[PDB]
């Protein structure tokens, strides 16, 4: 199903076509409100002057049973400020972008982290960037550190002299917990 259709290498960089390097990345974490890492890309990917400036959301997880939510505006959300937006990877509540060599490649987050609580329904809607909001819940114990990325690119969005930015999500997970008190 759409959960797992990994057959494309899709070699790409973090900055993509933008020439901005990691020294000038606008690195600010997802908001923390009642155990919810949210970094909504609303109004942060619109065409604007002095760009494209790469915007990176860093989610550092060190607690069990963590909920992570990411929002990207859809096409036509506001008049002529979100056209030609692209979402990478196309299946990104489950398939995630990982780093081998010096490239970003798609992989299944279930394989990287066991016990991922994928919610197929979020707010009675589908869980994908096709809705614009992605939702999943992390397990309470993680054996080893895992890093994966999500991409919300607005470089192709322009309005005369204005151009859109590029949105990146970096989720950084450290080991925590020992075991679950229960059955298997």
């Amino acid at each position: 199903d759409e959960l797992d259709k990994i057959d494309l290498s899709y070699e790409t960089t973090e900055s993509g076509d933008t020439a901005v390097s990691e020294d000038s990345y606008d690195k600010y974490a997802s908001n923390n409100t009642n155990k919810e890492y949210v970094c909504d890309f609303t109004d942060q990917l619109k065409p604007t002057e002095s760009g494209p400036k790469v915007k990176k959301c860093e989610v550092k997880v060190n607690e069990p049973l963590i909920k992570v939510k990411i929002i990207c505006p859809l096409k036509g959300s506001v008049e002529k400020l979100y056209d030609n937006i692209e979402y990478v990877p196309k299946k990104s509540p489950y398939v995630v972008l990982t780093k081998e060599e010096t490239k970003l490649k798609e992989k299944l987050l279930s394989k990287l982290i066991y016990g991922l609580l994928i919610s197929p329904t979020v707010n009675e809607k589908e869980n994908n960037f096709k809705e614009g909001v992605i939702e999943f819940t992390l397990p309470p114990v993680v054996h080893k550190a895992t890093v994966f990325y999500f991409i919300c690119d607005n470089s192709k969005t322009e309005d005369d002299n204005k151009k859109g930015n590029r949105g990146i999500v970096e989720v950084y997970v450290e080991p925590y917990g020992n075991k679950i008190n229960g059955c298997a």
Partner: antibody
Amino acid sequence: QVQLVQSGAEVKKPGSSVKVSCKVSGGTFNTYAIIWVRQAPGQGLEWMGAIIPFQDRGQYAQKFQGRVTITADKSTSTAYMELSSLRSEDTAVYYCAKESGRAVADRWGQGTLVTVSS
Amino acid sequence: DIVMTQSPASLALSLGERATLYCRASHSISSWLAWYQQKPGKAPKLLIYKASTLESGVPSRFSGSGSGTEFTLTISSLQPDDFATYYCQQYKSYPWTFGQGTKLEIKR
């Protein structure tokens, strides 16, 4: 802002081990790979290995096994290398580099010189 | 590993002349090639970080091109600070490699 610093040149006897110190100042350390290259004078450069600091599992060239060792320590933001069982022709300049997110090594260190003559 | 058959070995030119570097590959590869500049006693400095794009601060006379089995780097005109030894590196695969290098001789 980012800058790379390497140790000084060192001379070692054959059969000994040589250690090269690497430090990454500025940017961030965990989520970018640090690569190593050496070059015999008058000839082309040779790639040796790389590591991503958040994972201690590094990888090396298919031709070089065992002798080359690359490790990372996020507490000091360092990428030390240990090379063991040195032999002739190892007298070469050693270079360090890291990738800036554009899939290519964008920054290189000052370099180190190694001599192995008896 | 990916072989860097960089040609030629040396180039003798004067100020204001045109220089055209080349770096072929063992097999067809889509982009992911970089050119490094190095004078005697310098660290290899990155000037071109992709097929044709340039790093911040790199002069505009540099221009990269080519894809697949052949790549071409063309310098429109040489200035007093443009003579060095140049190398080409591929990173499509993890085992990176470097070429033999090209020399830029001053005057003839």
